Amino acid sequence: LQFALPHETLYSEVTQVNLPAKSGRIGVLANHVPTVEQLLPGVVEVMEGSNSKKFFISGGFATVQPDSQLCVTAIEAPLESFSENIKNLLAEAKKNVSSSREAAEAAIQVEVLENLQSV
Amino acid sequence: EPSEKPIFNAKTIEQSPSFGKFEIDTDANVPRDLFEYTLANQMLTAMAQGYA
Amino acid sequence: MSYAAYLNVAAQAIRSTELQTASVTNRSQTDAFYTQYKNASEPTPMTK
Amino acid sequence: MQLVLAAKYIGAGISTIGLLGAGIGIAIVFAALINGVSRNPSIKDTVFPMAILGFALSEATGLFCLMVSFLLLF
Amino acid sequence: MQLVLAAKYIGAGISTIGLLGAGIGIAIVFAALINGVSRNPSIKDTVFPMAILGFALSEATGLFCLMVSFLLL
Amino acid sequence: MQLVLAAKYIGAGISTIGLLGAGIGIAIVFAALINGVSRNPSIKDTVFPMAILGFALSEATGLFCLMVSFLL
Amino acid sequence: MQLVLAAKYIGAGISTIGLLGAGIGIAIVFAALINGVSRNPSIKDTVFPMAILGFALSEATGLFCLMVSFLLLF
Amino acid sequence: MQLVLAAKYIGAGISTIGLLGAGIGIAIVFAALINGVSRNPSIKDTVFPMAILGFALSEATGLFCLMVSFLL
Amino acid sequence: MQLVLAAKYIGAGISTIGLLGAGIGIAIVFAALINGVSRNPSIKDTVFPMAILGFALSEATGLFCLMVSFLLL
Amino acid sequence: QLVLAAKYIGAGISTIGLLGAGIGIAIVFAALINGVSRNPSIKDTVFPMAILGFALSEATGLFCLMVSFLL
Amino acid sequence: MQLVLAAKYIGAGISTIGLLGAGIGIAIVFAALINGVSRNPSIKDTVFPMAILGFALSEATGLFCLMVSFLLL
Amino acid sequence: LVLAAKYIGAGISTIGLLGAGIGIAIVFAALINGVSRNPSIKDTVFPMAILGFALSEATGLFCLMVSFLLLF
Amino acid sequence: QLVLAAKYIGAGISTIGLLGAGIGIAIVFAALINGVSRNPSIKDTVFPMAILGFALSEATGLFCLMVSFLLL
């Protein structure tokens, strides 16, 4: 129902959502305050009572609704059953590009990369 | 069917009647982003539909 | 890239030998070109 | 026994400075009570039951403080 | 009888420092009242029932404080 | 006397510390008044017809406080 | 005698200024408690405890402070 | 009579603590004025018309406080 | 020593104002503790261990302050 | 020797009022830099209002240091 | 002779007010430490190596302050 | 008495530094929070952490002056 | 007799100024950890302004402990 990538849409009833917001992590719950926040490039998780399932993400927007439905939208995304050397060899080329408008884009890679290392 | 759809910008987003209901922290350019990303997203949907 | 695209570099640094079977390898290759237009006549060509 | 009466009156006046704490104290709880309800939804119930419970526990400062001043005037 | 009268006057002046608390106290409630209504919509009704119920309970500091100073006069 | 006159003078000086509260008190209400109006729309409306009410009730501190010093 | 009784009464009044700290202290915990729950829903358990646990540890100031005043009152 | 003069001088020094309230008081209104203007829509409209109205009402603390010190 | 006993009692009362700092101090730490957990998920782990480490270091003010008053007793 | 003695304590008690002006300046300048962390109005608009705020808050200190120097 | 003993005791009590500053001081650093970690990523290392460094530099107020009280006691 | 109240007067003067001490902290706290927003450490804001600091330690210099005046 | 007595009260009254420096340090270090919960300048920018802020705020305490130790 409400948690979509443009190519692949994911989730539907929820007991606890954890998100990596604009200003630090947050947790929506059974009744929560209606809010919009930019979603920073980091991990996320769903809940169904006592069910642990964590995804990574690119970033985007979250929107807690008055009608109580939470909508989470990102671009790309299983946890470690998805993303080491794939990361490593890329991290090399990343840092290299930074020393180069063009190298500014690589700045974006360092933070996004460094984050993923922690998983 | 030839169709149209509205994109709204930063000012329109702040000024919207029920924007008050949403406890969006005015913590730096927040409606701006929502626009900049509703322009890409809306555009996509149109293109997907247009192509298909 | 942008913010508009922020999460398309965070999704394309985070793109780069698994899921990339068609799907993602192709989500990464875009073949678009822009050209600005002036007084009929154009400006010049460039990759998106 | 004039000093015991004299220092009793300064003592009662000095006791009143503690109400500075209870006075601001009540304000702080009610302020956050109206700010939290500007974000809703649980007006009466949830947030209102605690705000009176918070007021009671903060005016318990004032009643234990006015007691010491009234003790020293009686 | 010169000391009981003297210490009564300092005692009344010392009692006035408690109004520092009630003075700031009122401000705090009213400040949050206008800030909350800059978010809207429930001003008159819902919020105003508490906005001044909070003023009453915070000026009850001042009236119990002015009483001790006026008692020492 | 000369103690009742002396202690009346310190007593009058001591009563002036209560103005610390009303001085900060006004500022707080006016501060939140301008910050709430940086957010609109009701300027000379709802907000301002309460900020003066807040000022009055916070300078009622100072009037009851300057009374005890001028009394002494 | 006399001076020991006199300074005993000022001493008891001076002790009451410490409740300024505990009075504001309670407020602060309860204010953040209602603000945190304006984001829900850990109403009972999680928040309510830490609050009452925070209230207890902040009124432990007041009970150790009212003790010194009541010690000098009796 | 040496004590009415003595306690007149401590009484005038004690009166100066009340300026602690007006000194912070002005700062509070002015800080909120510049933070609200970091957001606009205008400085020349609505904000400043009260950002010194607030200053006046908060330095009215200091004038009533410096009066009691200069009186003693 | 009439005065040594008298100034001992005012000295013990004057020592009690330091608890104003420890009383407010505890509140500040616990307030930020509940606010941070209103954002989650670090209820157990991470935060609570700093919540009573911060409380201990702030009530160490009170125990070193109550000691000076009880010493003058 | 009492009017001279109480003159010196009276001059020291007057110095506590600077606590207010000392914190006061900080508040206006702190808000000045935080507001300019949002821009774009450093030269004109904002910096005018921040010396004006400083002046009116150190006017506390000048009226307070005068009563201490008076005594 | 005797007044030097009396004013020593009040002098020791008046020295305890400085602990109001360090008591609140600790709380401030620890409160910000738990709010910053309700945000991350800087839990162990980066933030904590400065956090108890902030505690030490703010309890150095209390040790220099309890020193003057214990000096007069 | 003139030497005695000179020493109490010199100790009472020191409470004014409570204002300057917190004062510096406030400016520097806002300087580091504003620069957590960037990009202007070198130029703009940090240069003024010395203009704000100087005007706030001018409190302490005029304050320590009255205490050292009542020392010599 | 009195010069020694008021020297001891004067040394105790000097200690209240540390209330300012004690809170002062906290404020700077608090904003230092909050600003770094946002990054990326943990080493350089962040701490060079912070430790410089601590020094300027403990300079209150050193000029304050000096007046107490001078009177003791």
UniProtKB/Swiss-Prot annotation, chain A:
Role, per record: Mitochondrial membrane ATP synthase (F(1)F(0) ATP synthase or Complex V) produces ATP from ADP in the presence of a proton gradient across the membrane which is generated by electron transport complexes of the respiratory chain. F-type ATPases consist of two structural domains, F(1) - containing the extramembraneous catalytic core, and F(0) - containing the membrane proton channel, linked together by a central stalk and a peripheral stalk. During catalysis, ATP turnover in the catalytic domain of F(1) is coupled via a rotary mechanism of the central stalk subunits to proton translocation.
Record key words, sorted: ATP synthesis, CF(1), Hydrogen ion transport, Ion transport, Membrane, Mitochondrion, Mitochondrion inner membrane, Transit peptide, Transport
Principal location class: mitochondrion
Taxonomic classification: Eukaryota, Fungi, Dikarya, Ascomycota, Saccharomycotina
Top-level taxon in the UniProt lineage: Eukaryota
Description of how the protein assembles with itself and partners: F-type ATPases have 2 components, CF(1) - the catalytic core - and CF(0) - the membrane proton channel. CF(1) has five subunits: alpha(3), beta(3), gamma(1), delta(1), epsilon(1). CF(0) has three main subunits: a, b and c.
Whole sequence portion shown: 34 to 158 of 160
Similarity annotation: Belongs to the ATPase epsilon chain family.
Cellular component terms per the entry's GO annotation: mitochondrial inner membrane; mitochondrion; proton-transporting ATP synthase complex
GO molecular function: proton-transporting ATP synthase activity, rotational mechanism
Location relative to the cell: Mitochondrion; Mitochondrion inner membrane
Native organism: Saccharomyces cerevisiae (strain ATCC 204508 / S288c)
GO biological process: proton motive force-driven ATP synthesis
Protein's recorded name: ATP synthase subunit delta, mitochondrial
Annotated gene: ATP16
Swiss-Prot record, chain B:
Localisation per UniProt entry: Mitochondrion; Mitochondrion inner membrane
Coiled coil: none
Protein's job: Mitochondrial membrane ATP synthase (F(1)F(0) ATP synthase or Complex V) produces ATP from ADP in the presence of a proton gradient across the membrane which is generated by electron transport complexes of the respiratory chain. F-type ATPases consist of two structural domains, F(1) - containing the extramembraneous catalytic core, and F(0) - containing the membrane proton channel, linked together by a central stalk and a peripheral stalk. During catalysis, ATP synthesis in the catalytic domain of F(1) is coupled via a rotary mechanism of the central stalk subunits to proton translocation.
Quaternary structure, from the entry: F-type ATPases have 2 components, CF(1) - the catalytic core - and CF(0) - the membrane proton channel. CF(1) has five subunits: alpha(3), beta(3), gamma(1), delta(1), epsilon(1). CF(0) has three main subunits: a, b and c.
Family per similarity comment: Belongs to the ATPase gamma chain family.
Note: Present with 28100 molecules/cell in log phase SD medium. PubMed:12898710 reports two tandemly repeated copies of ATP3 (ATP3a and ATP3b) on the right arm of chromosome II in several laboratory strains, including S288c. This has not been confirmed by the yeast genome sequencing project.
Protein name: ATP synthase subunit gamma, mitochondrial
Source species taxonomy: Eukaryota, Fungi, Dikarya, Ascomycota, Saccharomycotina
Curated annotation (Swiss-Prot), chains E, I, K:
N-formylmethionine, modified sites: M1
Effect of T46L: In strain: DS400/A3 and KL14-4A
Molecular function via GO: identical protein binding; lipid binding; proton transmembrane transporter activity
GO annotations of cellular component type: cytosol; mitochondrial inner membrane; mitochondrial intermembrane space; mitochondrion; proton-transporting ATP synthase complex; proton-transporting two-sector ATPase complex, proton-transporting domain
UniProt keywords, alphabetically: CF(0), Formylation, Hydrogen ion transport, Ion transport, Lipid-binding, Membrane, Mitochondrion, Transmembrane, Transmembrane helix, Transport
Subcellular localization(s) per the UniProt record: Mitochondrion membrane
Pfam families linked: ATP-synt_C (PF00137)
Residue pairs linked by disulfide bridges in the UniProt entry: none
PROSITE patterns: ATPASE_C (PS00605)
Primary location: mitochondrion
The keyword Transmembrane helix is assigned to this record: yes
Transmembrane segments: 14-34, 52-72
InterPro entries xrefs: ATP_synth_F0_csu, ATP_synth_F0_csu_DDCD_BS, ATP_synth_F0_csu_sf, ATPase_proteolipid_c-like_dom, F/V-ATP_Csub_sf
Annotated site residue numbers, Reversibly protonated during proton transport: E59
Outcome of mutating C65S: In oligomycin-resistant mutant
The keyword Ubl conjugation belongs to this UniProt entry's keyword annotation: no
Membrane topology term: Multi-pass membrane protein
Biological process annotations from GO: proton motive force-driven ATP synthesis
Family: Belongs to the ATPase C chain family.
Subunit structure: F-type ATPases have 2 components, CF(1) - the catalytic core - and CF(0) - the membrane proton channel. In yeast, the dimeric form of ATP synthase consists of 17 polypeptides: alpha, beta, gamma, delta, epsilon, 4 (B), 5 (OSCP), 6 (A), 8, 9 (C), d, E (Tim11), f, g, h, i/j and k.
PANTHER family the record matches: ATP SYNTHASE LIPID-BINDING PROTEIN, MITOCHONDRIAL, ATPASE PROTEIN 9
Name the UniProt record assigns to this protein: ATP synthase subunit 9, mitochondrial
Organism: Saccharomyces cerevisiae (strain ATCC 204508 / S288c)
Lineage: Eukaryota, Fungi, Dikarya, Ascomycota, Saccharomycotina
